[PDB]
């Protein structure tokens, strides 16, 4: 099939052949595994100090002073123990924890492809919280010569119907709950459009727009593709980027895109097909359980068991 390309004013401009990456099977579990491992790689190390709790000179007073046996300082102040105030942690955090997990290139390339396949799926994109009502097609490809001005970038977003999503991010700005505020994470804004570009300076124009993230086709990021480990980011593809998507995958050397599989809808149709229905045989009639009754009292109840006697 083909994908419609739209102009800056929202008119149809051309039709681009759909890249084969969009047919890659949609596997949410691969996206979650790669996202979890990759986000852990972007963690900074934390650890309590090596000398914490152990710079005191404390030795146990011992049995026979009616005290407990824990290390005590000169005045008998408890020390060097997890329970003690000012004691070392029982097992102190260390910077030698493995922070980064390992993902094989093949799976880290399946995750991106499946996430892109989810982007082609409007149903998944609506479920990810995007406002797609006015977007003319999903996937959306927009011709956009270098946009160096935010005002002009917004005018293209208004024409192509992505504006409601850009607004839902602007309005979302709020102060986060917790010590996140204190630790340089004060404001949370909902994430919305993603602009993938090639051979364009559209970055200067869309960067300030609230909620919009921009990436070059050559280096697409899964974390941007699936924010929250949820597949279905709204992607605005610039004509050049979407028409080069097949080249990027072709230049992934010895890589064959994961072969497409069937969907749930296609297996209900296949199950509903006459061939499967012909094989179906009608099941034998079930047992009638009923419930115990005293047959002796009722003429009718005895009659079910003893027709002659009644």
């Amino acid at each position: 099939p083909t994908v419609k390309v739209f102009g800056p004013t929202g008119t149809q401009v051309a039709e681009l052949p759909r890249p084969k990456v969009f047919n890659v099977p949609l596997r949410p579990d691969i996206i979650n595994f790669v996202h979890t491992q990759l986000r852990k790689c972007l963690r900074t190390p934390y650890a309590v100090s090596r000398y914490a709790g152990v710079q005191c000179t404390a030795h146990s007073w011992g049995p026979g002073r009616a005290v407990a046996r824990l290390p005590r300082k000169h005045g008998g102040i408890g020390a060097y123990a997890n329970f003690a105030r000012g004691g070392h942690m029982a097992h102190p955090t260390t910077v030698i924890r493995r922070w980064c997990r390992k993902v094989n290139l093949n799976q880290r390339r399946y995750a991106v492809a499946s996430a892109l396949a989810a982007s082609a799926n409007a149903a998944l994109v609506e479920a990810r919280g995007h406002r797609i009502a006015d977007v003319p097609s999903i996937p959306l490809v927009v011709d956009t010569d270098n946009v160096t001005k935010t005002k002009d970038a917004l005018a293209i977003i208004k024409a192509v119907g992505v504006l409601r999503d850009v607004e839902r991010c602007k309005d979302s700005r709020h102060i986060r709950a917790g010590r996140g505020k204190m630790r340089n994470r004060r404001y949370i804004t909902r994430k919305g459009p993603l602009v993938i570009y090639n051979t364009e300076d559209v970055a200067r124009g869309f960067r300030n727009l609230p909620g919009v993230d921009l990436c070059h086709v050559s280096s697409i990021r899964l974390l941007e593709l699936a924010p929250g480990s949820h597949p279905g980011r709204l992607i605005l593809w610039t004509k050049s980027a979407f028409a080069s998507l097949d080249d990027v995958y072709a230049a992934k050397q010895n890589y064959t895109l994961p072969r497409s599989c069937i969907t749930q809808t296609d297996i209900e149709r296949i199950l509903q097909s006459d061939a499967v229905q012909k094989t179906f045989v009608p099941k034998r009639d079930p047992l009638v359980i009923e419930r115990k009754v005293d047959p002796f009292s009722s003429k009718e109840a005895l009659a079910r068991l003893d027709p002659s006697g009644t």
Binding site: K181, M182, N184, R186, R207
Partner: protein, 133 residues
């Protein structure tokens, strides 16, 4: 976002700068929008507040016009003339209510000779910026 990594976006580091700033930085930090008549006249949006400045506070309590009589840099607050706290008895010294410089708009300035030179220096740098920096 900020591309100069040399600057800090840490709440703690930025707040320490405000709380513990050199006087020359405290003075610029205490600045107020010039009136639209003064904006046309001097072609500068904001000037650092001095002592002899007529100012209109558009704030909530104490909204009014007054001439600054005290600038308290350590508290980061200015005291206009006129705006004062309610007095418990009529026979008592009036206490000025401290107003933030950001809560007020300048209506007149103490031109001095250094202030004239400062408006000129800024006007020149703004003109270079307007010439496609």
């Amino acid at each position: 976002m900020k591309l100069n990594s040399a600057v800090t976006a840490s709440r703690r580091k930025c707040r320490k700068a405000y709380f513990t700033a050199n006087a020359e930085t405290r003075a610029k930090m205490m600045s107020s929008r010039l009136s639209k008549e003064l904006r046309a006249e001097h072609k500068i949006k904001t000037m650092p507040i001095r002592r002899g400045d007529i100012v209109e506070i558009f704030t909530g309590g104490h909204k009014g016009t007054g001439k600054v009589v005290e600038v308290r840099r350590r508290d980061y607050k200015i005291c206009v003339e006129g705006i004062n706290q309610k007095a418990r008895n009529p026979e008592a010294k009036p206490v000025p209510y401290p107003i933030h410089p950001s809560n007020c708009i300048i209506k007149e300035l103490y031109m001095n000779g250094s202030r004239y030179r400062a408006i000129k220096r800024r006007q020149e740098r703004n003109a270079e910026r307007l010439a496609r920096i």
